[PDB]
């Protein structure tokens, strides 16, 4: 329980590690739908249920296109991804041993407090709201329409122009 | 800002949520209102290089309202001691720290 | 007219979708401007006490609501009832 | 550098209400009418003085008028009050929208008495 | 291109700096770098050839990574001393990785290998926007951090941009890869004097923009992207040689012309801040930045390369040069040295 | 909170370590550029969600409207890399150095 | 005592789905003037057990050219999700109440795609690559609308919690305010849940058993167990979001009892469709749904924004 | 005739009432005859964790009769 | 925690149902039923070549709108603001520029399956 988010966090670092080794874009895309899901857990492990689901709505319909084009532009006769060579599988297993190494190194140097495996799980929320109402996220994201209505025009204009910026690149 | 066309027009385009203690959505607070306020009403009209040496009490505190680090070593030195003290004993935890209490 | 008003007639026979969309678009922004009840949306939404109303302290001033809630002074919304 | 100066375990000992939320929501609107001068002054200390340990005594009266509020329920008009929250706590969010018949039955019992 | 697409993309370009300017948050100030990153790519690719695509990819992938390395330093700063500004007591590697990323947006030390490759394989219009207008918003990150830059690495990125923008400009016959390495040379002057009175880097930018814009617009006039093509200009428009002799001997700073002014009063600010040994290494290499202008004005002006007879038709068909944009920007430079106190 | 951000900063870096070492695909580098964004979404949300800085909670979406609009312009160039070559290999575009 | 609730939540939907395989063969039959199963049981009540127990004895094809890891995970991922969407689905009081109990649906509804993409991509075959690609441009088509047709309804409701609609529908069905939404929702409940008049993905006649052709019996059932399990959700939602049955909280089994009566119609309404209409050729479906529904959606999306503020009808955030 | 369909429906029709009517009777058994008492906000959780602390650790009980 | 009790199950209900499908059919896998299908012949090409889609531009307009959809989703809470006149306008401005962005593409032949 106390070791909840350190697990969700290290399974994210790994979901972004194999993502960095650059297998075929499918098993990288799979490597991001996972880490995007895992991102919905820790964002939600610290409160707001909205923001986590968003990543887990964008980068589903995001990676649904990444499945489409890779079948048309980015794909070999043989994908040759993870269980296909030993150059990736070494630096996929020695990245994880480097992880268990490194985090276990600097709990010995428990002076900067970058990780405190003994003082773990006890510092995650920091005095939230206990008696309270109308506090969740989505009240903040809805400031696009009150008191932060410039985040709104500036991002809407990007999508108004993306629709024109994109076709002149195809044409 | 360079080409500051916000003060020239007066309007707050986006300079009203740069920091934590800045008009939260309905009426909430941003967990360090008391300290950032005391830091930034201090560093007004004294700007910059002299907000860095004399208004250091307010940042050293706001650097610990926010990071909240020294409370960890002050709360990890406890465990390190008790985990050492017990395991060779000399400490019997009370009821209200091992479970059973009278909640209120 | 005829050269504009009868163009809508085929655009209502064929293409009978954009006419609704372009209508409901033009029929959405226009109605709050000619309503009797649009004033209340920013008022029914301003009455909700989500946060606690901090009381002031009496210093010989502000002949408002005294230290009694059911006292006829103050924002007594009898408009929400009997809307 | 400094120490934190705060009460002792006996300086904040009070007769607890020891009462649940559902029954407490029921008698709330009357708890706003009565026991208001004794509760707002706590808040007026609480928001003006930003410290639990400088607004301590006023709290003891918040939990002293509420008792004198329920003591007047326990003697006068207790049974119809039990019939009220006993249905209200059946819901999953304690809505007044359902227990609206026992509400007047308790309000007329308390409009006449007290 | 369709005007409803042109105006939108000529306007996002007008938002990138202007939102990087009129915004204190380092998030509004971030997106401004992206409006200037989305909008450019549709006009890099107007011909859709194997030269425009490779530049845009080499302009996009090289420059979105920088927008992330920037955005890290905000979030790393949104945690420490929670706000949206590099306040005063932010950590170093937050900013030395910010300045890192800006140097990729601009192209300085080894971050220059994308600029000429992109400034090559591109029209001359849209060669002028990168080197002049895309360059203003990154600096608007970088004047706002007026103090509190590492004086050590801000200065190796200068010298490395004097060398690599001078050694490299010798080889290159294509004018577009020359002007790329001029931008890199002159940025070591914009960028070394950033802690040291950066009312002088706002200067060296407004000078440099007045030098290039006539030049790139002097190459639009005949679409000459080669020394051997700017050479045969005495037969097409010989009236232009009088400026380019000065536009280049100024853009490589010689005193009676204004393009020595920034190279000069900068050094004063360097000498006056007790770095007597750095400014020399620059100024000894700004002379090498004349050799491929001395050599270039020879091939252009002071020796008539052997032209073509097919060019005899060009002496019939009455071109039209712009107005208020060249005559101004070539006399408002190269003849404004005596007004230096008004500049600074 | 000070166990994930070292672990998320270290997840940004591996993706920065990935989108600088290529493996013969332009479309796996664009792909590695979105998990780069993603660690900044989360390392921005939490900072805006343990601090209860709801006023900054509009920011983790504005960051992300430019995570797909940048990918959109990114994906659309592959259409124009493929239609020259049809293979999408980064080693195939080297005819600018000339 | 919670596992005994899942046990009474998953058994009574895998045992229902099974008899939708039957009911999807008889109702279609009598329209075709042909009795369906009559023999294995009294009236075909015992045919899916044969069909089920038949499929877990045949050789699950491990094809020679494939990716055996994603091969096995897609049916694990399909039967997981569409079964796992019943968790917050509020018969009056749900197993798991959620504030964002409908974004849970949308997001997990989208992961039912990757069971169709990873399958046909793993399985090396042209006739399965297509069916994978046939979902890509299908999700691209409706998913813009399964949100806004679902937002603008939940715009004159408040929170995304599905439990609130039982109180929004305390005196009326939302079918009458929004029949335009309910029309396009019905078709968007029909593109998602690829079972359809426009199937396009398991096309027997074009793409024979698309996304599904290299799969033999063992893994094969987990799609039918997932597809016919998902037919009942996206009708069960219409019996919550648009057709509001009776709450009356002292007999909560009246909600669940009227919840039956309408969900079977909307589950029996899909059955008239498959027996009544052909497919959209896969270029119309995205010309039928970006051109005709998408503008008409944004309009009513805009109308229901100016519906309460025009009048007063602001949903409360309880 | 068509009446042979009703077995497939009315056996499917005694199969989707259970997860609705079982979801309540299983809640009332666990929650003490009350409903599950869902908590969407941070206030309704406080009342629980208060009522959890005015009794034995189960929170579906004690009220007035005390003082 | 209560949901992990629901969903680790459904993995096991799937994972326990798949192990009893590979290890209880009595298989005979040799060579020619494992090899791919193409309707009774040996496939010409290799099944993993560039597909070359034709809806490439619409996939991006979706890729932009999934943001825009996400950029709508806070409206149920935005109506619970005290202003409800910038939320009014700025909700019209977002939906309108979308349809303008959608109608431009609709005329410039974006969603038309290049052919
Ligand atoms: C309804 C949904 C739930 C789905 C699960 C259904 C549960 C009910 C299934 C019960 C049936 C169990 C036995 C099926 C095995 C059939 C395969 C078979 O014929 O094996 C023959 C083989 C016979 O082996 P053999 O000796 O004849 O030689 C095998 C190879 N040949 C014939 C080619 C030489 O082994 C068995 O007897 C199967 C016993 C399996 C019992 C395991 C439990
Ligand atoms: C710390 C622990 C976290 C894990 C650290 C990394 C080690 C785990 C193994 C990853 C590498 C395995 C591999 O090579 O994958 C390719 C393999 C390749 O196999 P294949 O599909 O090509 O077929 C191989 C056929 N045989 C068996 C005959 C050789 O496929 C996969 O495993 C992909 C699935 C990845 C699983 C991760 C996603 C979670 C599930 C999604 C829901
Ligand atoms: C004062 C102190 C401050 C420091 C002063 C520094 C020195 C001044 C700068 C000198 C550099 C500029 C002069 C060099 C230009 C290059 C040479 C040149 O342009 O002439 C060659 C060119 C030959 O071309 P051709 O085809 O033969 O035509 C000849 C007649 N049409 O001949 C041409 O055709 C070009 C001209 C054709 C159009 C007629 C214009 C005549 C030129 C007028 C400019 C005269 C210089 C200005 C006055 C000096 C400014 C201080
Ligand atoms: C090749 C370029 C080599 C890099 C430059 C190295 C010289 C660094 C100059 C630093 C200034 C200096 O020499 O002394 C410091 C003095 C005041 O500073 P101080 O008070 O000592 O503290 O300030 C001075 O005395 C000012 C000295 C002026 C700058 C001297 C530049 C060197 C000139 C000598 C060579 C000139 C001849 C041509 C080249 C011959 C080969 C070296
Ligand atoms: C050691 C760390 C350096 C990175 C490891 C990978 C080696 C590398 O430089 O990447 C080269 C590779 C280029 O692509 P390619 O052309 O296909 O290579 C063919 C070579 N025959 O490009 C790549 O493979 C992409 C590299 C991304 C690597 C991301 C994961 C790095 C995690 C391992 C870190 C190193 C482990 C440290 C262990 C410490 C020991 C305690
Ligand atoms: C074969 C491959 C299978 C792998 C993929 C499986 C996909 C599973 C389906 C995806 C789930 C959709 C996203 C769920 C997000 C959580 C939904 C939510 O927002 O509500 C969570 C809820 C708290 O939210 P809320 O109720 O609104 O807060 C107010 C308090 N009532 O209550 C909570 O806080 C609970 C939140 C955590 C629940 C996450 C469930 C994770 C299940 C484990 C997945 C990994 C599988 C295990 C490993 C096996 C190996 C494969």
PDB file of C-alpha atoms in Angstrom, chain A residues 19-161:
ATOM      1  CA  UNK A  19       9.803   3.177 -25.510  1.00  0.00           C
ATOM      2  CA  UNK A  20      13.258   4.777 -25.807  1.00  0.00           C
ATOM      3  CA  UNK A  21      15.031   1.705 -27.203  1.00  0.00           C
ATOM      4  CA  UNK A  22      12.917   2.273 -30.339  1.00  0.00           C
ATOM      5  CA  UNK A  23      11.441  -1.063 -31.310  1.00  0.00           C
ATOM      6  CA  UNK A  24       8.961  -1.032 -34.168  1.00  0.00           C
ATOM      7  CA  UNK A  25       6.428   1.792 -33.664  1.00  0.00           C
ATOM      8  CA  UNK A  26       3.784  -0.769 -32.689  1.00  0.00           C
ATOM      9  CA  UNK A  27       5.624  -2.065 -29.629  1.00  0.00           C
ATOM     10  CA  UNK A  28       6.597   1.516 -28.886  1.00  0.00           C
ATOM     11  CA  UNK A  29       2.979   2.541 -29.228  1.00  0.00           C
ATOM     12  CA  UNK A  30       2.060  -0.357 -26.982  1.00  0.00           C
ATOM     13  CA  UNK A  31       4.818   0.943 -24.726  1.00  0.00           C
ATOM     14  CA  UNK A  32       2.972   4.270 -24.453  1.00  0.00           C
ATOM     15  CA  UNK A  33      -0.624   3.075 -24.097  1.00  0.00           C
ATOM     16  CA  UNK A  34       0.690   1.246 -21.037  1.00  0.00           C
ATOM     17  CA  UNK A  35       2.678   4.172 -19.657  1.00  0.00           C
ATOM     18  CA  UNK A  36      -0.261   6.415 -20.493  1.00  0.00           C
ATOM     19  CA  UNK A  37      -2.516   4.126 -18.494  1.00  0.00           C
ATOM     20  CA  UNK A  38       0.059   4.018 -15.704  1.00  0.00           C
ATOM     21  CA  UNK A  39       0.085   7.808 -15.838  1.00  0.00           C
ATOM     22  CA  UNK A  40      -3.656   7.770 -15.215  1.00  0.00           C
ATOM     23  CA  UNK A  41      -2.921   5.861 -12.002  1.00  0.00           C
ATOM     24  CA  UNK A  42      -0.416   8.179 -10.312  1.00  0.00           C
ATOM     25  CA  UNK A  43      -2.197  11.338 -11.451  1.00  0.00           C
ATOM     26  CA  UNK A  44      -5.174   9.654  -9.805  1.00  0.00           C
ATOM     27  CA  UNK A  45      -3.059   8.358  -6.927  1.00  0.00           C
ATOM     28  CA  UNK A  46      -2.586  12.021  -5.960  1.00  0.00           C
ATOM     29  CA  UNK A  47      -6.221  13.056  -6.442  1.00  0.00           C
ATOM     30  CA  UNK A  48      -7.786  14.290  -9.661  1.00  0.00           C
ATOM     31  CA  UNK A  49      -9.556  11.635 -11.680  1.00  0.00           C
ATOM     32  CA  UNK A  50     -10.120  13.931 -14.657  1.00  0.00           C
ATOM     33  CA  UNK A  51      -6.531  14.646 -15.726  1.00  0.00           C
ATOM     34  CA  UNK A  52      -5.500  10.997 -15.655  1.00  0.00           C
ATOM     35  CA  UNK A  53      -8.388   9.870 -17.849  1.00  0.00           C
ATOM     36  CA  UNK A  54      -7.553  12.623 -20.347  1.00  0.00           C
ATOM     37  CA  UNK A  55      -4.148  11.145 -21.206  1.00  0.00           C
ATOM     38  CA  UNK A  56      -5.981   7.826 -21.330  1.00  0.00           C
ATOM     39  CA  UNK A  57      -8.384   9.338 -23.888  1.00  0.00           C
ATOM     40  CA  UNK A  58      -6.007  11.395 -26.036  1.00  0.00           C
ATOM     41  CA  UNK A  59      -3.243   8.805 -26.345  1.00  0.00           C
ATOM     42  CA  UNK A  60      -5.727   6.115 -27.277  1.00  0.00           C
ATOM     43  CA  UNK A  61      -7.133   8.082 -30.189  1.00  0.00           C
ATOM     44  CA  UNK A  62      -3.593   9.359 -30.534  1.00  0.00           C
ATOM     45  CA  UNK A  63      -1.931   5.976 -30.896  1.00  0.00           C
ATOM     46  CA  UNK A  64      -4.811   4.752 -33.051  1.00  0.00           C
ATOM     47  CA  UNK A  65      -3.378   6.912 -35.835  1.00  0.00           C
ATOM     48  CA  UNK A  66       0.151   5.781 -34.958  1.00  0.00           C
ATOM     49  CA  UNK A  67      -1.065   2.259 -35.707  1.00  0.00           C
ATOM     50  CA  UNK A  68      -2.450   3.463 -39.022  1.00  0.00           C
ATOM     51  CA  UNK A  69       0.492   5.281 -40.568  1.00  0.00           C
ATOM     52  CA  UNK A  70       3.156   2.831 -39.393  1.00  0.00           C
ATOM     53  CA  UNK A  71       1.402   0.141 -41.438  1.00  0.00           C
ATOM     54  CA  UNK A  72       1.735   2.509 -44.424  1.00  0.00           C
ATOM     55  CA  UNK A  73       5.053   4.331 -43.853  1.00  0.00           C
ATOM     56  CA  UNK A  74       7.023   2.884 -40.924  1.00  0.00           C
ATOM     57  CA  UNK A  75       7.231  -0.905 -41.042  1.00  0.00           C
ATOM     58  CA  UNK A  76       9.780  -3.410 -42.300  1.00  0.00           C
ATOM     59  CA  UNK A  77       9.433  -6.844 -43.816  1.00  0.00           C
ATOM     60  CA  UNK A  78      10.430  -7.965 -40.298  1.00  0.00           C
ATOM     61  CA  UNK A  79       9.739  -5.768 -37.221  1.00  0.00           C
ATOM     62  CA  UNK A  80      12.738  -7.022 -35.176  1.00  0.00           C
ATOM     63  CA  UNK A  81      11.614  -5.452 -31.915  1.00  0.00           C
ATOM     64  CA  UNK A  82      12.532  -6.950 -28.502  1.00  0.00           C
ATOM     65  CA  UNK A  83      12.866 -10.731 -28.706  1.00  0.00           C
ATOM     66  CA  UNK A  84      14.685 -10.345 -32.004  1.00  0.00           C
ATOM     67  CA  UNK A  85      18.285  -9.431 -31.161  1.00  0.00           C
ATOM     68  CA  UNK A  86      20.543  -8.927 -28.132  1.00  0.00           C
ATOM     69  CA  UNK A  87      21.511  -5.258 -28.536  1.00  0.00           C
ATOM     70  CA  UNK A  88      18.120  -4.158 -27.191  1.00  0.00           C
ATOM     71  CA  UNK A  89      17.576  -7.026 -24.771  1.00  0.00           C
ATOM     72  CA  UNK A  90      20.823  -6.259 -22.968  1.00  0.00           C
ATOM     73  CA  UNK A  91      20.055  -2.572 -22.545  1.00  0.00           C
ATOM     74  CA  UNK A  92      16.496  -3.520 -21.600  1.00  0.00           C
ATOM     75  CA  UNK A  93      17.713  -5.805 -18.794  1.00  0.00           C
ATOM     76  CA  UNK A  94      20.764  -3.741 -17.818  1.00  0.00           C
ATOM     77  CA  UNK A  95      18.565  -0.650 -17.726  1.00  0.00           C
ATOM     78  CA  UNK A  96      16.395  -2.322 -15.111  1.00  0.00           C
ATOM     79  CA  UNK A  97      19.377  -3.623 -13.143  1.00  0.00           C
ATOM     80  CA  UNK A  98      20.739  -0.085 -13.372  1.00  0.00           C
ATOM     81  CA  UNK A  99      17.418   1.026 -11.893  1.00  0.00           C
ATOM     82  CA  UNK A 100      17.498  -1.379  -8.951  1.00  0.00           C
ATOM     83  CA  UNK A 101      21.151  -0.414  -8.617  1.00  0.00           C
ATOM     84  CA  UNK A 102      20.724   3.357  -8.727  1.00  0.00           C
ATOM     85  CA  UNK A 103      17.708   3.772  -6.446  1.00  0.00           C
ATOM     86  CA  UNK A 104      19.411   1.417  -3.988  1.00  0.00           C
ATOM     87  CA  UNK A 105      22.660   3.394  -4.269  1.00  0.00           C
ATOM     88  CA  UNK A 106      21.306   6.703  -3.065  1.00  0.00           C
ATOM     89  CA  UNK A 107      19.184   5.491  -0.208  1.00  0.00           C
ATOM     90  CA  UNK A 108      22.586   4.909   1.399  1.00  0.00           C
ATOM     91  CA  UNK A 109      23.214   8.615   0.758  1.00  0.00           C
ATOM     92  CA  UNK A 110      20.004   9.488   2.593  1.00  0.00           C
ATOM     93  CA  UNK A 111      20.968  13.174   2.869  1.00  0.00           C
ATOM     94  CA  UNK A 112      19.375  14.720  -0.241  1.00  0.00           C
ATOM     95  CA  UNK A 113      16.276  12.554   0.231  1.00  0.00           C
ATOM     96  CA  UNK A 114      15.787  11.768  -3.448  1.00  0.00           C
ATOM     97  CA  UNK A 115      14.270   8.432  -2.420  1.00  0.00           C
ATOM     98  CA  UNK A 116      13.668   7.309   1.176  1.00  0.00           C
ATOM     99  CA  UNK A 117      12.727   3.633   0.960  1.00  0.00           C
ATOM    100  CA  UNK A 118      12.264   3.534   4.748  1.00  0.00           C
ATOM    101  CA  UNK A 119      10.367   6.836   4.821  1.00  0.00           C
ATOM    102  CA  UNK A 120       8.329   5.853   1.778  1.00  0.00           C
ATOM    103  CA  UNK A 121       4.595   6.137   1.291  1.00  0.00           C
ATOM    104  CA  UNK A 122       4.176   8.621   4.151  1.00  0.00           C
ATOM    105  CA  UNK A 123       4.601  11.799   2.032  1.00  0.00           C
ATOM    106  CA  UNK A 124       2.121  11.792  -0.873  1.00  0.00           C
ATOM    107  CA  UNK A 125      -0.872  14.137  -0.250  1.00  0.00           C
ATOM    108  CA  UNK A 126       0.266  16.890   2.161  1.00  0.00           C
ATOM    109  CA  UNK A 127      -2.786  18.090   4.089  1.00  0.00           C
ATOM    110  CA  UNK A 128      -5.457  18.246   1.452  1.00  0.00           C
ATOM    111  CA  UNK A 129      -8.960  19.293   2.422  1.00  0.00           C
ATOM    112  CA  UNK A 130     -10.479  16.852   4.872  1.00  0.00           C
ATOM    113  CA  UNK A 131     -13.601  18.946   5.619  1.00  0.00           C
ATOM    114  CA  UNK A 132     -14.497  20.299   2.215  1.00  0.00           C
ATOM    115  CA  UNK A 133     -16.481  20.297  -1.013  1.00  0.00           C
ATOM    116  CA  UNK A 134     -16.085  21.501  -4.594  1.00  0.00           C
ATOM    117  CA  UNK A 135     -12.353  20.853  -4.657  1.00  0.00           C
ATOM    118  CA  UNK A 136     -11.543  18.236  -7.318  1.00  0.00           C
ATOM    119  CA  UNK A 137      -9.787  18.786 -10.585  1.00  0.00           C
ATOM    120  CA  UNK A 138     -11.921  19.786 -13.506  1.00  0.00           C
ATOM    121  CA  UNK A 139     -12.947  22.798 -11.475  1.00  0.00           C
ATOM    122  CA  UNK A 140      -9.473  24.073 -12.247  1.00  0.00           C
ATOM    123  CA  UNK A 141      -9.476  22.917 -15.859  1.00  0.00           C
ATOM    124  CA  UNK A 142     -12.785  24.761 -16.242  1.00  0.00           C
ATOM    125  CA  UNK A 143     -11.002  28.038 -15.511  1.00  0.00           C
ATOM    126  CA  UNK A 144     -10.582  28.129 -19.304  1.00  0.00           C
ATOM    127  CA  UNK A 145     -13.959  29.910 -19.161  1.00  0.00           C
ATOM    128  CA  UNK A 146     -13.461  32.001 -16.006  1.00  0.00           C
ATOM    129  CA  UNK A 147     -10.235  33.822 -15.054  1.00  0.00           C
ATOM    130  CA  UNK A 148      -8.015  31.841 -17.481  1.00  0.00           C
ATOM    131  CA  UNK A 149      -9.749  32.460 -20.805  1.00  0.00           C
ATOM    132  CA  UNK A 150      -6.456  33.002 -22.637  1.00  0.00           C
ATOM    133  CA  UNK A 151      -5.335  29.395 -22.273  1.00  0.00           C
ATOM    134  CA  UNK A 152      -8.570  28.793 -24.194  1.00  0.00           C
ATOM    135  CA  UNK A 153      -8.248  31.115 -27.205  1.00  0.00           C
ATOM    136  CA  UNK A 154      -4.547  30.330 -27.594  1.00  0.00           C
ATOM    137  CA  UNK A 155      -5.122  26.564 -27.761  1.00  0.00           C
ATOM    138  CA  UNK A 156      -8.273  26.804 -29.846  1.00  0.00           C
ATOM    139  CA  UNK A 157      -6.395  28.903 -32.384  1.00  0.00           C
ATOM    140  CA  UNK A 158      -3.751  26.187 -32.580  1.00  0.00           C
ATOM    141  CA  UNK A 159      -6.386  23.689 -33.672  1.00  0.00           C
ATOM    142  CA  UNK A 160      -8.027  26.205 -35.983  1.00  0.00           C
ATOM    143  CA  UNK A 161      -4.639  26.649 -37.653  1.00  0.00           C
TER     144      UNK A 161
END
